[PDB]
Assembly symmetry: C3
Homo-oligomer: 130 residues x 3
């Protein structure tokens, strides 16, 4: 039996009051990831670049656990500019099907006032593996 | 056995990286719905009208699956004006009990900066059926 | 068998379209709590004081049910000032381990535009008890 707690060597890492992710068993969940630039360690200005890195981090954790984005049941993403979603949404959906994730997980994205680390976007989705 | 994926002919419909809703089986979940005006296809200015339509869409999906709002375990709603919640909250609670939903599902509403489609409100709640 | 619904005599109490909390059984969930000052009934200006009270309310409900913060699988908290998180995060993590909550539940905090009751912060986390 297992419950939450998900270690990995790709995500932003956990060193505070939270872990990289949580594996409840059969139903996984990813914390509010962020485009922690691999060279700046924060959030690339390139809404597309930062948007792509954030997706890799969220998947890296779920992948290190033994799953895939395709399994993602639901997904949530906070944006600092709903006008930029045009590029993120176009690439967000184009990658899922390009990764074999046509299931299309639930969505819950909204324009928040701000985000941790001044990040221009956050990612938090759920995944299953029945 | 089932997992996520919920089709319907009432909700805003899914044509991107997400589905109308997701049925994990026994525990359903609705995506961030929106008052997609049946005549404008976006969000009626009438905070009350748009607030009512949004509730119907969220219920239409759960209803098309085989459940009811009364079963809703938790609920989340983003507002663009916490001052308007006075009318939404008054009608939100008056409809639940009027629909046989006295259980009172969890709440998680907050004043967000913006919302998809420039909608003045979003709805995302969970439902059970043990 | 049980499903949602969690009564208590410590939390902000439920008198509208939502209950104090919801106990799905084995997997609990707390609604968007708030620092409802015990003397003002709203939200203390002391970001630290209000931040501490909010934590007690969220735990009071889960405690009245038969669990602890340590069991918390995931956690979400809306802030009105990401600059204040420096004090909340420092005390948030210092209390978990001080309460025996080193598990570190998932995180999902963001700077929202506003919050119910003009509260300067909201709390909503999940808990397990397998």
């Amino acid at each position: 039996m297992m419950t939450q707690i998900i270690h990995t060597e790709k995500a932003p890492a956990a060193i505070g009051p939270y872990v990289q992710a949580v594996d409840l068993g059969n139903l996984v969940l990813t914390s509010g990831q962020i485009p922690v630039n691999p060279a700046t360690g924060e959030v690339p200005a390139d809404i597309v670049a930062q948007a792509r890195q954030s997706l890799e981090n969220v998947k890296a954790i779920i992948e290190k656990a033994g799953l895939t984005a395709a399994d993602i049941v639901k997904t949530t993403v906070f944006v600092k500019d709903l006008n930029d979603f045009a590029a993120v949404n176009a690439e967000y959906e184009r990658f899922f099907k390009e990764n074999n994730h046509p299931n299309f997980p639930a969505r819950s994205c909204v324009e928040v006032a701000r985000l941790p680390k001044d990040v221009g976007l956050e990612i938090e989705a759920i995944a299953v593996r029945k």
